[PDB]
mmCIF file with all atom_site columns, C-alpha atoms and ligand atoms in Angstrom:
data_model
loop_
_atom_site.group_PDB
_atom_site.id
_atom_site.type_symbol
_atom_site.label_atom_id
_atom_site.label_alt_id
_atom_site.label_comp_id
_atom_site.label_asym_id
_atom_site.label_entity_id
_atom_site.label_seq_id
_atom_site.pdbx_PDB_ins_code
_atom_site.Cartn_x
_atom_site.Cartn_y
_atom_site.Cartn_z
_atom_site.occupancy
_atom_site.B_iso_or_equiv
_atom_site.pdbx_formal_charge
_atom_site.auth_seq_id
_atom_site.auth_comp_id
_atom_site.auth_asym_id
_atom_site.auth_atom_id
_atom_site.pdbx_PDB_model_num
ATOM   1   C  CA  . UNK A 1 1   ? 40.700 -19.404 -18.948 1.00 0.00 ? 3   UNK A CA  1
ATOM   2   C  CA  . UNK A 1 2   ? 37.785 -16.697 -18.006 1.00 0.00 ? 4   UNK A CA  1
ATOM   3   C  CA  . UNK A 1 3   ? 38.642 -13.465 -17.025 1.00 0.00 ? 5   UNK A CA  1
ATOM   4   C  CA  . UNK A 1 4   ? 38.303 -12.798 -13.209 1.00 0.00 ? 6   UNK A CA  1
ATOM   5   C  CA  . UNK A 1 5   ? 35.035 -10.853 -12.302 1.00 0.00 ? 7   UNK A CA  1
ATOM   6   C  CA  . UNK A 1 6   ? 35.425 -7.274  -10.181 1.00 0.00 ? 8   UNK A CA  1
ATOM   7   C  CA  . UNK A 1 7   ? 33.913 -6.686  -6.799  1.00 0.00 ? 9   UNK A CA  1
ATOM   8   C  CA  . UNK A 1 8   ? 32.922 -3.406  -5.619  1.00 0.00 ? 10  UNK A CA  1
ATOM   9   C  CA  . UNK A 1 9   ? 30.629 -1.737  -2.534  1.00 0.00 ? 11  UNK A CA  1
ATOM   10  C  CA  . UNK A 1 10  ? 27.663 0.609   -2.901  1.00 0.00 ? 12  UNK A CA  1
ATOM   11  C  CA  . UNK A 1 11  ? 27.942 3.677   -1.619  1.00 0.00 ? 13  UNK A CA  1
ATOM   12  C  CA  . UNK A 1 12  ? 31.365 2.884   -0.433  1.00 0.00 ? 14  UNK A CA  1
ATOM   13  C  CA  . UNK A 1 13  ? 33.505 0.106   1.061   1.00 0.00 ? 15  UNK A CA  1
ATOM   14  C  CA  . UNK A 1 14  ? 33.772 2.911   4.244   1.00 0.00 ? 16  UNK A CA  1
ATOM   15  C  CA  . UNK A 1 15  ? 30.608 2.554   6.021   1.00 0.00 ? 17  UNK A CA  1
ATOM   16  C  CA  . UNK A 1 16  ? 29.579 3.767   9.351   1.00 0.00 ? 18  UNK A CA  1
ATOM   17  C  CA  . UNK A 1 17  ? 28.591 1.520   12.063  1.00 0.00 ? 19  UNK A CA  1
ATOM   18  C  CA  . UNK A 1 18  ? 24.830 0.268   11.423  1.00 0.00 ? 20  UNK A CA  1
ATOM   19  C  CA  . UNK A 1 19  ? 24.444 1.614   8.077   1.00 0.00 ? 21  UNK A CA  1
ATOM   20  C  CA  . UNK A 1 20  ? 23.764 -0.154  5.110   1.00 0.00 ? 22  UNK A CA  1
ATOM   21  C  CA  . UNK A 1 21  ? 26.220 -1.629  2.049   1.00 0.00 ? 23  UNK A CA  1
ATOM   22  C  CA  . UNK A 1 22  ? 25.718 -3.549  -1.314  1.00 0.00 ? 24  UNK A CA  1
ATOM   23  C  CA  . UNK A 1 23  ? 28.580 -5.886  -2.525  1.00 0.00 ? 25  UNK A CA  1
ATOM   24  C  CA  . UNK A 1 24  ? 28.349 -6.423  -6.135  1.00 0.00 ? 26  UNK A CA  1
ATOM   25  C  CA  . UNK A 1 25  ? 30.124 -8.714  -8.129  1.00 0.00 ? 27  UNK A CA  1
ATOM   26  C  CA  . UNK A 1 26  ? 30.427 -8.525  -12.140 1.00 0.00 ? 28  UNK A CA  1
ATOM   27  C  CA  . UNK A 1 27  ? 32.148 -11.322 -14.447 1.00 0.00 ? 29  UNK A CA  1
ATOM   28  C  CA  . UNK A 1 28  ? 31.218 -11.949 -18.003 1.00 0.00 ? 30  UNK A CA  1
ATOM   29  C  CA  . UNK A 1 29  ? 27.924 -11.436 -19.652 1.00 0.00 ? 31  UNK A CA  1
ATOM   30  C  CA  . UNK A 1 30  ? 27.658 -15.547 -19.506 1.00 0.00 ? 32  UNK A CA  1
ATOM   31  C  CA  . UNK A 1 31  ? 27.977 -15.874 -16.073 1.00 0.00 ? 33  UNK A CA  1
ATOM   32  C  CA  . UNK A 1 32  ? 25.788 -18.655 -14.592 1.00 0.00 ? 34  UNK A CA  1
ATOM   33  C  CA  . UNK A 1 33  ? 26.170 -18.470 -11.216 1.00 0.00 ? 35  UNK A CA  1
ATOM   34  C  CA  . UNK A 1 34  ? 28.578 -16.279 -8.430  1.00 0.00 ? 36  UNK A CA  1
ATOM   35  C  CA  . UNK A 1 35  ? 30.220 -17.081 -5.205  1.00 0.00 ? 37  UNK A CA  1
ATOM   36  C  CA  . UNK A 1 36  ? 31.436 -14.680 -2.599  1.00 0.00 ? 38  UNK A CA  1
ATOM   37  C  CA  . UNK A 1 37  ? 33.765 -15.374 0.099   1.00 0.00 ? 39  UNK A CA  1
ATOM   38  C  CA  . UNK A 1 38  ? 35.376 -13.112 3.298   1.00 0.00 ? 40  UNK A CA  1
ATOM   39  C  CA  . UNK A 1 39  ? 38.883 -13.819 4.207   1.00 0.00 ? 41  UNK A CA  1
ATOM   40  C  CA  . UNK A 1 40  ? 39.312 -15.090 7.729   1.00 0.00 ? 42  UNK A CA  1
ATOM   41  C  CA  . UNK A 1 41  ? 41.313 -13.435 10.455  1.00 0.00 ? 43  UNK A CA  1
ATOM   42  C  CA  . UNK A 1 42  ? 43.921 -15.627 11.587  1.00 0.00 ? 44  UNK A CA  1
ATOM   43  C  CA  . UNK A 1 43  ? 42.627 -18.888 10.069  1.00 0.00 ? 45  UNK A CA  1
ATOM   44  C  CA  . UNK A 1 44  ? 43.547 -20.341 6.881   1.00 0.00 ? 46  UNK A CA  1
ATOM   45  C  CA  . UNK A 1 45  ? 40.536 -20.809 5.735   1.00 0.00 ? 47  UNK A CA  1
ATOM   46  C  CA  . UNK A 1 46  ? 38.122 -18.462 4.171   1.00 0.00 ? 48  UNK A CA  1
ATOM   47  C  CA  . UNK A 1 47  ? 34.344 -17.773 4.795   1.00 0.00 ? 49  UNK A CA  1
ATOM   48  C  CA  . UNK A 1 48  ? 31.593 -18.865 2.195   1.00 0.00 ? 50  UNK A CA  1
ATOM   49  C  CA  . UNK A 1 49  ? 28.715 -15.785 1.917   1.00 0.00 ? 51  UNK A CA  1
ATOM   50  C  CA  . UNK A 1 50  ? 25.782 -18.285 2.020   1.00 0.00 ? 52  UNK A CA  1
ATOM   51  C  CA  . UNK A 1 51  ? 24.467 -18.252 -1.521  1.00 0.00 ? 53  UNK A CA  1
ATOM   52  C  CA  . UNK A 1 52  ? 20.833 -17.635 -0.332  1.00 0.00 ? 54  UNK A CA  1
ATOM   53  C  CA  . UNK A 1 53  ? 22.335 -13.814 0.487   1.00 0.00 ? 55  UNK A CA  1
ATOM   54  C  CA  . UNK A 1 54  ? 23.778 -13.565 -2.939  1.00 0.00 ? 56  UNK A CA  1
ATOM   55  C  CA  . UNK A 1 55  ? 21.210 -12.753 -5.449  1.00 0.00 ? 57  UNK A CA  1
ATOM   56  C  CA  . UNK A 1 56  ? 22.679 -11.826 -9.041  1.00 0.00 ? 58  UNK A CA  1
ATOM   57  C  CA  . UNK A 1 57  ? 26.050 -11.610 -7.662  1.00 0.00 ? 59  UNK A CA  1
ATOM   58  C  CA  . UNK A 1 58  ? 24.633 -8.794  -4.991  1.00 0.00 ? 60  UNK A CA  1
ATOM   59  C  CA  . UNK A 1 59  ? 25.133 -9.128  -1.225  1.00 0.00 ? 61  UNK A CA  1
ATOM   60  C  CA  . UNK A 1 60  ? 23.200 -6.570  0.823   1.00 0.00 ? 62  UNK A CA  1
ATOM   61  C  CA  . UNK A 1 61  ? 23.899 -5.832  4.721   1.00 0.00 ? 63  UNK A CA  1
ATOM   62  C  CA  . UNK A 1 62  ? 21.312 -3.867  6.205   1.00 0.00 ? 64  UNK A CA  1
ATOM   63  C  CA  . UNK A 1 63  ? 23.298 -2.541  8.964   1.00 0.00 ? 65  UNK A CA  1
ATOM   64  C  CA  . UNK A 1 64  ? 27.270 -3.141  8.890   1.00 0.00 ? 66  UNK A CA  1
ATOM   65  C  CA  . UNK A 1 65  ? 28.602 -4.619  12.146  1.00 0.00 ? 67  UNK A CA  1
ATOM   66  C  CA  . UNK A 1 66  ? 32.192 -5.353  12.577  1.00 0.00 ? 68  UNK A CA  1
ATOM   67  C  CA  . UNK A 1 67  ? 32.034 -8.839  12.126  1.00 0.00 ? 69  UNK A CA  1
ATOM   68  C  CA  . UNK A 1 68  ? 31.165 -7.658  8.144   1.00 0.00 ? 70  UNK A CA  1
ATOM   69  C  CA  . UNK A 1 69  ? 34.910 -6.271  7.873   1.00 0.00 ? 71  UNK A CA  1
ATOM   70  C  CA  . UNK A 1 70  ? 37.529 -7.455  6.033   1.00 0.00 ? 72  UNK A CA  1
ATOM   71  C  CA  . UNK A 1 71  ? 38.816 -8.771  2.206   1.00 0.00 ? 73  UNK A CA  1
ATOM   72  C  CA  . UNK A 1 72  ? 36.150 -10.209 0.048   1.00 0.00 ? 74  UNK A CA  1
ATOM   73  C  CA  . UNK A 1 73  ? 36.589 -11.847 -3.345  1.00 0.00 ? 75  UNK A CA  1
ATOM   74  C  CA  . UNK A 1 74  ? 34.353 -13.235 -5.740  1.00 0.00 ? 76  UNK A CA  1
ATOM   75  C  CA  . UNK A 1 75  ? 34.043 -15.815 -8.191  1.00 0.00 ? 77  UNK A CA  1
ATOM   76  C  CA  . UNK A 1 76  ? 31.665 -16.875 -11.261 1.00 0.00 ? 78  UNK A CA  1
ATOM   77  C  CA  . UNK A 1 77  ? 31.054 -20.041 -13.255 1.00 0.00 ? 79  UNK A CA  1
ATOM   78  C  CA  . UNK A 1 78  ? 31.163 -20.356 -17.042 1.00 0.00 ? 80  UNK A CA  1
ATOM   79  C  CA  . UNK A 1 79  ? 31.805 -22.571 -19.606 1.00 0.00 ? 81  UNK A CA  1
ATOM   80  C  CA  . UNK A 1 80  ? 31.687 -25.328 -16.868 1.00 0.00 ? 82  UNK A CA  1
ATOM   81  C  CA  . UNK A 1 81  ? 34.643 -23.872 -14.711 1.00 0.00 ? 83  UNK A CA  1
ATOM   82  C  CA  . UNK A 1 82  ? 34.706 -21.161 -11.810 1.00 0.00 ? 84  UNK A CA  1
ATOM   83  C  CA  . UNK A 1 83  ? 36.637 -18.009 -12.422 1.00 0.00 ? 85  UNK A CA  1
ATOM   84  C  CA  . UNK A 1 84  ? 39.717 -17.195 -9.927  1.00 0.00 ? 86  UNK A CA  1
ATOM   85  C  CA  . UNK A 1 85  ? 38.733 -14.968 -7.424  1.00 0.00 ? 87  UNK A CA  1
ATOM   86  C  CA  . UNK A 1 86  ? 38.557 -11.202 -8.061  1.00 0.00 ? 88  UNK A CA  1
ATOM   87  C  CA  . UNK A 1 87  ? 40.795 -8.465  -6.924  1.00 0.00 ? 89  UNK A CA  1
ATOM   88  C  CA  . UNK A 1 88  ? 40.049 -8.312  -3.228  1.00 0.00 ? 90  UNK A CA  1
ATOM   89  C  CA  . UNK A 1 89  ? 37.480 -5.821  -1.858  1.00 0.00 ? 91  UNK A CA  1
ATOM   90  C  CA  . UNK A 1 90  ? 38.100 -4.339  1.753   1.00 0.00 ? 92  UNK A CA  1
ATOM   91  C  CA  . UNK A 1 91  ? 35.101 -3.623  3.205   1.00 0.00 ? 93  UNK A CA  1
ATOM   92  C  CA  . UNK A 1 92  ? 35.711 -1.091  6.064   1.00 0.00 ? 94  UNK A CA  1
ATOM   93  C  CA  . UNK A 1 93  ? 33.480 -0.144  9.505   1.00 0.00 ? 95  UNK A CA  1
ATOM   94  C  CA  . UNK A 1 94  ? 34.100 3.452   11.177  1.00 0.00 ? 96  UNK A CA  1
ATOM   95  C  CA  . UNK A 1 95  ? 32.638 4.656   14.085  1.00 0.00 ? 97  UNK A CA  1
ATOM   96  C  CA  . UNK A 1 96  ? 33.700 2.128   16.478  1.00 0.00 ? 98  UNK A CA  1
ATOM   97  C  CA  . UNK A 1 97  ? 35.662 4.568   18.645  1.00 0.00 ? 99  UNK A CA  1
ATOM   98  C  CA  . UNK A 1 98  ? 35.317 8.113   19.089  1.00 0.00 ? 100 UNK A CA  1
ATOM   99  C  CA  . UNK A 1 99  ? 36.971 10.465  16.740  1.00 0.00 ? 101 UNK A CA  1
ATOM   100 C  CA  . UNK A 1 100 ? 40.633 11.883  17.142  1.00 0.00 ? 102 UNK A CA  1
ATOM   101 C  CA  . UNK A 1 101 ? 41.407 15.473  16.722  1.00 0.00 ? 103 UNK A CA  1
ATOM   102 C  CA  . UNK A 1 102 ? 42.985 16.950  13.608  1.00 0.00 ? 104 UNK A CA  1
ATOM   103 C  CA  . UNK A 1 103 ? 45.164 20.428  13.321  1.00 0.00 ? 105 UNK A CA  1
ATOM   104 C  CA  . UNK A 1 104 ? 47.800 22.073  11.210  1.00 0.00 ? 106 UNK A CA  1
ATOM   105 C  CA  . UNK A 1 105 ? 51.341 23.393  11.842  1.00 0.00 ? 107 UNK A CA  1
ATOM   106 C  CA  . UNK A 1 106 ? 52.413 26.479  11.553  1.00 0.00 ? 108 UNK A CA  1
ATOM   107 C  CA  . UNK A 1 107 ? 48.712 27.064  10.036  1.00 0.00 ? 109 UNK A CA  1
ATOM   108 C  CA  . UNK A 1 108 ? 45.934 25.898  8.296   1.00 0.00 ? 110 UNK A CA  1
ATOM   109 C  CA  . UNK A 1 109 ? 46.253 28.332  5.222   1.00 0.00 ? 111 UNK A CA  1
ATOM   110 C  CA  . UNK A 1 110 ? 49.535 27.995  3.595   1.00 0.00 ? 112 UNK A CA  1
ATOM   111 C  CA  . UNK A 1 111 ? 51.321 29.593  0.635   1.00 0.00 ? 113 UNK A CA  1
ATOM   112 C  CA  . UNK A 1 112 ? 50.994 28.009  -3.009  1.00 0.00 ? 114 UNK A CA  1
ATOM   113 C  CA  . UNK A 1 113 ? 53.778 25.263  -3.088  1.00 0.00 ? 115 UNK A CA  1
ATOM   114 C  CA  . UNK A 1 114 ? 54.365 24.823  0.749   1.00 0.00 ? 116 UNK A CA  1
ATOM   115 C  CA  . UNK A 1 115 ? 54.607 21.975  2.762   1.00 0.00 ? 117 UNK A CA  1
ATOM   116 C  CA  . UNK A 1 116 ? 52.688 21.484  6.205   1.00 0.00 ? 118 UNK A CA  1
ATOM   117 C  CA  . UNK A 1 117 ? 52.399 19.438  8.943   1.00 0.00 ? 119 UNK A CA  1
ATOM   118 C  CA  . UNK A 1 118 ? 49.252 17.634  9.922   1.00 0.00 ? 120 UNK A CA  1
ATOM   119 C  CA  . UNK A 1 119 ? 48.902 16.230  13.491  1.00 0.00 ? 121 UNK A CA  1
ATOM   120 C  CA  . UNK A 1 120 ? 46.275 14.004  14.768  1.00 0.00 ? 122 UNK A CA  1
ATOM   121 C  CA  . UNK A 1 121 ? 45.841 13.223  18.291  1.00 0.00 ? 123 UNK A CA  1
ATOM   122 C  CA  . UNK A 1 122 ? 43.393 11.287  20.474  1.00 0.00 ? 124 UNK A CA  1
ATOM   123 C  CA  . UNK A 1 123 ? 42.831 10.976  24.153  1.00 0.00 ? 125 UNK A CA  1
ATOM   124 C  CA  . UNK A 1 124 ? 43.309 7.387   24.333  1.00 0.00 ? 126 UNK A CA  1
ATOM   125 C  CA  . UNK A 1 125 ? 46.047 5.353   22.557  1.00 0.00 ? 127 UNK A CA  1
ATOM   126 C  CA  . UNK A 1 126 ? 45.339 3.532   19.283  1.00 0.00 ? 128 UNK A CA  1
ATOM   127 C  CA  . UNK A 1 127 ? 47.672 1.101   17.155  1.00 0.00 ? 129 UNK A CA  1
ATOM   128 C  CA  . UNK A 1 128 ? 47.808 3.388   14.402  1.00 0.00 ? 130 UNK A CA  1
ATOM   129 C  CA  . UNK A 1 129 ? 46.373 6.375   12.104  1.00 0.00 ? 131 UNK A CA  1
ATOM   130 C  CA  . UNK A 1 130 ? 45.500 6.906   9.016   1.00 0.00 ? 132 UNK A CA  1
ATOM   131 C  CA  . UNK A 1 131 ? 45.244 10.565  6.822   1.00 0.00 ? 133 UNK A CA  1
ATOM   132 C  CA  . UNK A 1 132 ? 43.178 10.511  4.131   1.00 0.00 ? 134 UNK A CA  1
ATOM   133 C  CA  . UNK A 1 133 ? 42.609 13.693  1.741   1.00 0.00 ? 135 UNK A CA  1
ATOM   134 C  CA  . UNK A 1 134 ? 39.493 13.680  -1.253  1.00 0.00 ? 136 UNK A CA  1
ATOM   135 C  CA  . UNK A 1 135 ? 39.559 16.291  -3.828  1.00 0.00 ? 137 UNK A CA  1
ATOM   136 C  CA  . UNK A 1 136 ? 36.871 17.208  -6.455  1.00 0.00 ? 138 UNK A CA  1
ATOM   137 C  CA  . UNK A 1 137 ? 39.638 15.753  -9.000  1.00 0.00 ? 139 UNK A CA  1
ATOM   138 C  CA  . UNK A 1 138 ? 41.312 12.374  -7.264  1.00 0.00 ? 140 UNK A CA  1
ATOM   139 C  CA  . UNK A 1 139 ? 40.629 9.208   -5.412  1.00 0.00 ? 141 UNK A CA  1
ATOM   140 C  CA  . UNK A 1 140 ? 41.272 9.204   -1.917  1.00 0.00 ? 142 UNK A CA  1
ATOM   141 C  CA  . UNK A 1 141 ? 44.898 8.951   -0.649  1.00 0.00 ? 143 UNK A CA  1
ATOM   142 C  CA  . UNK A 1 142 ? 45.215 7.584   2.877   1.00 0.00 ? 144 UNK A CA  1
ATOM   143 C  CA  . UNK A 1 143 ? 48.878 8.093   4.580   1.00 0.00 ? 145 UNK A CA  1
ATOM   144 C  CA  . UNK A 1 144 ? 49.447 5.491   7.067   1.00 0.00 ? 146 UNK A CA  1
ATOM   145 C  CA  . UNK A 1 145 ? 51.447 6.565   10.526  1.00 0.00 ? 147 UNK A CA  1
ATOM   146 C  CA  . UNK A 1 146 ? 54.540 4.300   11.841  1.00 0.00 ? 148 UNK A CA  1
ATOM   147 C  CA  . UNK A 1 147 ? 52.682 1.679   13.944  1.00 0.00 ? 149 UNK A CA  1
ATOM   148 C  CA  . UNK A 1 148 ? 54.625 2.222   17.483  1.00 0.00 ? 150 UNK A CA  1
ATOM   149 C  CA  . UNK A 1 149 ? 55.102 -0.378  20.074  1.00 0.00 ? 151 UNK A CA  1
ATOM   150 C  CA  . UNK A 1 150 ? 52.304 -0.035  22.762  1.00 0.00 ? 152 UNK A CA  1
ATOM   151 C  CA  . UNK A 1 151 ? 49.935 2.118   20.400  1.00 0.00 ? 153 UNK A CA  1
ATOM   152 C  CA  . UNK A 1 152 ? 49.898 5.839   20.474  1.00 0.00 ? 154 UNK A CA  1
ATOM   153 C  CA  . UNK A 1 153 ? 47.987 9.140   20.892  1.00 0.00 ? 155 UNK A CA  1
ATOM   154 C  CA  . UNK A 1 154 ? 49.394 11.115  18.357  1.00 0.00 ? 156 UNK A CA  1
ATOM   155 C  CA  . UNK A 1 155 ? 50.458 10.886  14.853  1.00 0.00 ? 157 UNK A CA  1
ATOM   156 C  CA  . UNK A 1 156 ? 52.663 13.643  12.585  1.00 0.00 ? 158 UNK A CA  1
ATOM   157 C  CA  . UNK A 1 157 ? 52.126 13.818  8.623   1.00 0.00 ? 159 UNK A CA  1
ATOM   158 C  CA  . UNK A 1 158 ? 53.626 15.854  6.188   1.00 0.00 ? 160 UNK A CA  1
ATOM   159 C  CA  . UNK A 1 159 ? 51.501 16.944  3.074   1.00 0.00 ? 161 UNK A CA  1
ATOM   160 C  CA  . UNK A 1 160 ? 51.897 18.849  0.279   1.00 0.00 ? 162 UNK A CA  1
ATOM   161 C  CA  . UNK A 1 161 ? 52.781 20.874  -2.067  1.00 0.00 ? 163 UNK A CA  1
ATOM   162 C  CA  . UNK A 1 162 ? 49.545 22.202  -1.770  1.00 0.00 ? 164 UNK A CA  1
ATOM   163 C  CA  . UNK A 1 163 ? 47.936 23.991  -4.724  1.00 0.00 ? 165 UNK A CA  1
ATOM   164 C  CA  . UNK A 1 164 ? 45.485 26.257  -5.279  1.00 0.00 ? 166 UNK A CA  1
ATOM   165 C  CA  . UNK A 1 165 ? 43.382 24.770  -7.964  1.00 0.00 ? 167 UNK A CA  1
ATOM   166 C  CA  . UNK A 1 166 ? 43.079 21.563  -5.676  1.00 0.00 ? 168 UNK A CA  1
ATOM   167 C  CA  . UNK A 1 167 ? 40.581 20.818  -2.610  1.00 0.00 ? 169 UNK A CA  1
ATOM   168 C  CA  . UNK A 1 168 ? 42.908 19.733  0.117   1.00 0.00 ? 170 UNK A CA  1
ATOM   169 C  CA  . UNK A 1 169 ? 40.098 18.564  2.618   1.00 0.00 ? 171 UNK A CA  1
ATOM   170 C  CA  . UNK A 1 170 ? 41.543 15.719  5.077   1.00 0.00 ? 172 UNK A CA  1
ATOM   171 C  CA  . UNK A 1 171 ? 40.073 13.514  7.847   1.00 0.00 ? 173 UNK A CA  1
ATOM   172 C  CA  . UNK A 1 172 ? 41.840 11.385  10.332  1.00 0.00 ? 174 UNK A CA  1
ATOM   173 C  CA  . UNK A 1 173 ? 40.674 7.783   11.591  1.00 0.00 ? 175 UNK A CA  1
ATOM   174 C  CA  . UNK A 1 174 ? 42.381 5.980   14.557  1.00 0.00 ? 176 UNK A CA  1
ATOM   175 C  CA  . UNK A 1 175 ? 42.556 1.782   14.283  1.00 0.00 ? 177 UNK A CA  1
ATOM   176 C  CA  . UNK A 1 176 ? 43.599 -0.987  16.491  1.00 0.00 ? 178 UNK A CA  1
ATOM   177 C  CA  . UNK A 1 177 ? 46.489 -3.355  14.910  1.00 0.00 ? 179 UNK A CA  1
ATOM   178 C  CA  . UNK A 1 178 ? 44.298 -6.221  15.553  1.00 0.00 ? 180 UNK A CA  1
ATOM   179 C  CA  . UNK A 1 179 ? 41.144 -5.358  13.701  1.00 0.00 ? 181 UNK A CA  1
ATOM   180 C  CA  . UNK A 1 180 ? 42.637 -2.930  11.001  1.00 0.00 ? 182 UNK A CA  1
ATOM   181 C  CA  . UNK A 1 181 ? 39.431 -2.747  9.146   1.00 0.00 ? 183 UNK A CA  1
ATOM   182 C  CA  . UNK A 1 182 ? 37.372 -1.296  11.931  1.00 0.00 ? 184 UNK A CA  1
ATOM   183 C  CA  . UNK A 1 183 ? 37.901 2.393   12.372  1.00 0.00 ? 185 UNK A CA  1
ATOM   184 C  CA  . UNK A 1 184 ? 37.364 5.320   14.679  1.00 0.00 ? 186 UNK A CA  1
ATOM   185 C  CA  . UNK A 1 185 ? 34.360 8.020   13.622  1.00 0.00 ? 187 UNK A CA  1
ATOM   186 C  CA  . UNK A 1 186 ? 36.550 10.449  11.693  1.00 0.00 ? 188 UNK A CA  1
ATOM   187 C  CA  . UNK A 1 187 ? 38.165 13.644  13.018  1.00 0.00 ? 189 UNK A CA  1
ATOM   188 C  CA  . UNK A 1 188 ? 36.460 17.135  11.985  1.00 0.00 ? 190 UNK A CA  1
ATOM   189 C  CA  . UNK A 1 189 ? 37.501 17.782  8.399   1.00 0.00 ? 191 UNK A CA  1
ATOM   190 C  CA  . UNK A 1 190 ? 40.319 20.101  8.004   1.00 0.00 ? 192 UNK A CA  1
ATOM   191 C  CA  . UNK A 1 191 ? 40.561 22.032  4.820   1.00 0.00 ? 193 UNK A CA  1
ATOM   192 C  CA  . UNK A 1 192 ? 44.164 23.273  3.920   1.00 0.00 ? 194 UNK A CA  1
ATOM   193 C  CA  . UNK A 1 193 ? 43.482 26.869  2.220   1.00 0.00 ? 195 UNK A CA  1
ATOM   194 C  CA  . UNK A 1 194 ? 46.269 28.732  -0.466  1.00 0.00 ? 196 UNK A CA  1
ATOM   195 C  CA  . UNK A 1 195 ? 45.970 32.895  -0.352  1.00 0.00 ? 197 UNK A CA  1
ATOM   196 C  CA  . UNK A 1 196 ? 46.469 34.022  -3.837  1.00 0.00 ? 198 UNK A CA  1
HETATM 197 CL CL1 . CL  B 2 .   ? 29.701 -3.275  15.400  1.00 0.00 ? 201 CL  B CL1 1
HETATM 198 CL CL1 . CL  B 2 .   ? 54.454 9.710   14.141  1.00 0.00 ? 202 CL  B CL1 1
#
């Protein structure tokens, strides 16, 4: 009967090991109190974040560690009841593993409208890879490789129709299936360019 709050992370929900992040819950203007939770990996109960650590629905993490990663949700209290939990915020830590290599075939320079193959490679196998694109006009879109039986050290993605106007800068990350919110250092940025 009371609208569920939202939950966000500042500056981002993808944060390098040791760096700070703040999670913010915001409910109705008449919220009297907030609670924050994180979902347990392989336990049916969830973790209450200690109330001494949530001030005005804010939970500040001075240096993120692997133990902070996972799904968070929050509620607030108003009109004698607690709200349902927010939509989950997934907090991710990067930099736990050496970065993979990212390359384009046939070329990082691609005619407008053409498609291209990107390859993410690693010296040691990962459970899976993700290829993320960020541009001036859109949110991060990550393609996911299909996880394989005993992990893999190479993944192949197809990207584009590339267009001139957009910016097509990609990075790729490796992760292990049993802790999927702990990622490698990102690969070097690979920018696809269109001659025109
Ligand atoms: Cl850590
Ligand atoms: Cl693949």
